[PDB]
């Protein structure tokens, strides 16, 4: 943290943050969500980290170079250590990226190495080559060299993500899935794991072996797993919680802006809220049905009437304010809702649905006040505008993500947040073979548009391709875009260091501090 001249620090430097749900795991290779990554950034540190405004900056690597954007050389700081006092070396990164690529790990983020095009990743994922063939090597203890199969000018931006953080081989090997328990885990971030009580709290304490430990201020941070945004706000206003999770309740939000204006932080956020359709299961494999659902949803009602928290109605997957996004707003989004409804009803009628044989299906969402209230409104809108019947189903976060990968569901509430600020961070998740493709969408045309983005060496050509890729997704009605999120959360006046300037919201508790109050 960088404490400004003149601020008076509290004697006790502890923090309590809500984290939305119970984490899936603390193993960097088994996690895929925001809650998981929030904790991961305090415990595991990769080559680069985000600074407090979100710019990619030195992590374990103090400096790096590239040759033609294909061979990246990372110079690791000599004093980087794990929490047991042992050095963090390039060998740690070799083992860790191999483990991420290895099909035996079954990482949900194995395709992150495809997004960066590390050499030989496709064959490794397919089991055609051993994970030891991956295009990574340690040139010495403090030098990690990555070789890509084609130039990737933004490669370094990918490196702040948890999937490419190092894991401690000896602990993984000796304890298996219990390596993350407090007695066994070893971490290299600013914090260490103190306590993990499932569905109650995760408590982290300062890691004195962290290389930048002298700048760390907060001595202990607790992460809570509260999925009710109303409860989160209640425990924040009672004094227990210092920073809520950034999902706000429909119940109280209006009231909050009027009651505590300076505590309500509202900043840009590269995430898109949408209803994910299982594209591989009839009747959702019919483009007419998917289009009907996309068009009959009334975004103005949801975004401005039922939710109304600063979100913008969406017409795409990639947020239009992503760096590199120059999207074409489709004609259907400019129409009146009445015109969208008529076309939707027409399409469903063409698909064979009638009053006596209506379309009835499930809408899966993870436990949440926000998601439940929005799914109820969406069910009423689709019923009224299109005559379709929806059965709502809630699941807790970890189960919910597994269900979507299992891919026999109908429609699920979904939200993707960028891992790096570039359109492929969204677009690559819709590739036919992506490990993040929970839409189960497979379009050879779409895949080809993305493949061509690194075969041109011009930003305009790349941007026009990303725009065409969004058009391909939209033409196929792969998803039902609802709104682009804003990063809205409550932060006590005494919490310093949270700028809200990072559109990825990559917070590190090592950057925060408690002002005397």
The residues that touch U ion, with contacts defined as CB under 5 A, are 11, 323, 362, 369, 410
φ, ψ for residue 272, nearest 5 deg:
-125, 130
Q: What distance in Å separates the CA atoms of residue 216 and residue 243, rounded to the nearest whole number? A: 18
**Shortest Cβ distance from residue 479 to U ion (Å)?**
18
- 116 or 166: whose CB is closer to U ion? 116
**Shortest Cβ distance from residue 120 to U ion (Å)?**
25
**Shortest Cβ distance from residue 426 to U ion (Å)?**
16
**Shortest Cβ distance from residue 56 to U ion (Å)?**
11
The secondary structure of residue 219, as a DSSP letter, is S
Residue nearest to U ion (CB): 11
What DSSP string describes 458-476?
Answer: -HHHHHHHHHHHHHHHHHT
**Shortest Cβ distance from residue 153 to U ion (Å)?**
5
**Shortest Cβ distance from residue 143 to U ion (Å)?**
24
- 8 or 338: whose CB is closer to U ion? 8
Query: Which tokens go with 16?
Result: 């309590």
- 102 or 410: whose CB is closer to U ion? 410
Query: Please, which residues bridge with residue 193 across strands?
Result: 204
Q: How far apart are the first and last CA of the chain?
A: 19
3-class SS letters over 295-332: HHCCHHHHHHHHHCCCCEECCCCCCCCCCCCCCCCCHH
Of 509, 507, 514, the C-alpha closest to 160 is: 507
Q: Are 46 and 164 in contact (CB under 8 A)?
A: yes
**Shortest Cβ distance from residue 332 to U ion (Å)?**
26
Dihedral sign of CA atoms 418, 424, 426, 432 in order:
negative
- 87 or 153: whose CB is closer to U ion? 153
- 318 or 434: whose CB is closer to U ion? 318
**Shortest Cβ distance from residue 156 to U ion (Å)?**
10
Q: Are 30 and 107 in contact (CB under 8 A)?
A: yes
Helix (H, G, I), strand (E, B) or coil at 183: coil
Dihedral sign of CA atoms 24, 189, 220, 228 in order:
negative
Q: Which helix (H) or strand (E) holds 478?
A: none
Query: Please, which residues bridge with residue 206 across strands?
Result: 191
Residues 6+ apart with CB under 8 A from 297: 275, 378, 381, 382, 385, 480, 482
**Shortest Cβ distance from residue 494 to U ion (Å)?**
9
- 27 or 369: whose CB is closer to U ion? 369
Q: Which helix (H) or strand (E) holds 231?
A: helix 229-237
Q: Is 471 exposed, middle or buried (0-12, 13-18, 19+ CB in 10 A)?
A: middle
Torsion of CA 187, 165, 500, 312, to 10 degrees: -140
Of 295, 294, 293, 313, the C-alpha closest to 303 is: 313
**Shortest Cβ distance from residue 69 to U ion (Å)?**
9
**Shortest Cβ distance from residue 241 to U ion (Å)?**
17
- 323 or 476: whose CB is closer to U ion? 323
- 276 or 410: whose CB is closer to U ion? 410
Q: Is 163 exposed, middle or buried (0-12, 13-18, 19+ CB in 10 A)?
A: buried
Query: Which tokens go with 173?
Result: 């090997």
- 156 or 397: whose CB is closer to U ion? 156
Q: Which helix (H) or strand (E) holds 399?
A: helix 397-406
- 104 or 460: whose CB is closer to U ion? 460
Q: Are 59 and 40 in contact (CB under 8 A)?
A: no
- 87 or 283: whose CB is closer to U ion? 283
Q: Is 442 exposed, middle or buried (0-12, 13-18, 19+ CB in 10 A)?
A: middle
**Shortest Cβ distance from residue 110 to U ion (Å)?**
27
**Shortest Cβ distance from residue 333 to U ion (Å)?**
26
Query: Which tokens go with 199?
Result: 């569905």
Residues 6+ apart with CB under 8 A from 380: none
Of 289, 270, 271, 269, the C-alpha closest to 279 is: 289
- 209 or 278: whose CB is closer to U ion? 278
- 138 or 252: whose CB is closer to U ion? 252
């Amino acid at each position: 943290a960088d404490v400004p001249a003149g601020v008076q620090l509290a004697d006790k430097q502890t923090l309590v943050r809500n984290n939305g749900s119970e984490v899936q795991s603390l193993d960097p290779h088994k996690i895929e969500g925001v809650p998981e990554s929030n904790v991961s950034r305090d415990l595991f540190e990769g080559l680069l980290i985000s600074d407090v405004e979100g710019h990619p900056s030195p992590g374990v690597a103090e400096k790096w170079e590239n040759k033609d954007f294909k061979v990246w050389t990372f110079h690791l700081r000599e004093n980087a250590k794990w929490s047991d006092g042992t050095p963090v070396t390039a060998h740690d990164f070799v083992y860790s990226w191999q483990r991420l690529a290895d099909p035996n790990t079954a990482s949900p983020y194995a395709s992150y190495l495809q997004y960066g095009h590390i050499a030989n990743i496709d064959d490794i994922i397919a089991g055609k080559k051993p994970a030891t063939d991956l295009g990574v090597k340690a040139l010495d203890d403090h030098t990690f060299e990555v070789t890509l199969s084609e130039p990737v000018p933004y490669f370094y931006k990918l490196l702040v993500h948890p999937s490419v953080s190092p894991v401690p081989k000896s602990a993984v090997e000796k304890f298996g899935d219990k390596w993350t328990q407090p007695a066994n885990i070893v971490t290299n971030g600013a914090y260490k794991l103190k306590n993990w009580v499932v569905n109650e709290r995760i408590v982290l304490e300062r890691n004195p072996q962290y290389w930048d430990n002298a700048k760390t201020v907060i001595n202990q941070v607790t992460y809570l797993p509260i999925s009710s945004e109303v409860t989160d706000v209640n425990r924040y206003r009672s004094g227990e919680i210092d920073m809520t999770y950034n999902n706000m309740p429909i119940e109280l939000f209006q009231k909050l802006k009027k009651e505590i204006p300076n505590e309500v932080r509202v900043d840009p956020y590269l995430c898109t809220y949408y209803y994910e359709i299982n594209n591989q299961k009839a009747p959702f494999n019919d483009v007419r049905v998917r289009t009907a659902l996309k068009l009959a949803l009334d975004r103005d009602i949801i975004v401005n009437k039922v939710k109304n928290q600063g979100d913008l109605p969406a017409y795409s997957y990639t947020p239009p304010y992503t760096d590199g996004a120059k999207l074409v707003e489709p004609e259907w989004f400019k129409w009146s809702q009445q015109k969208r409804n008529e076309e939707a009803k027409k399409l469903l009628a063409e698909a064979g649905f009638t009053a006596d044989k209506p379309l009835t299906f499930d809408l899966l969402y993870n436990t949440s006040d926000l998601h439940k209230k929005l799914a109820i409104a969406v069910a009423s809108i689709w019923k009224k505008n299109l005559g379709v019947n929806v059965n709502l189903e809630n699941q807790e976060w970890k189960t919910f993500l597994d269900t979507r990968h299992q891919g026999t569901f109908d429609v699920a509430r979904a939200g993707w947040c960028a891992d790096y600020n570039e359109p492929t961070s969204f677009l690559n998740t819709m590739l036919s073979d992506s490990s993040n493709n929970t839409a189960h969408y497979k379009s050879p045309a779409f895949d080809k548009l993305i493949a061509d983005t690194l075969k041109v060496a011009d930003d305009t050509q790349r941007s026009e391709l990303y725009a065409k890729a969004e058009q391909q997704l939209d033409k196929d009605s792969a998803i039902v875009p609802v709104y682009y999120y804003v990063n809205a959360r409550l932060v006590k006046p005494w919490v310093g260091g949270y700028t809200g300037k990072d559109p990825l919201d990559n917070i590190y508790v090592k950057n925060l501090y408690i002002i005397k109050h």
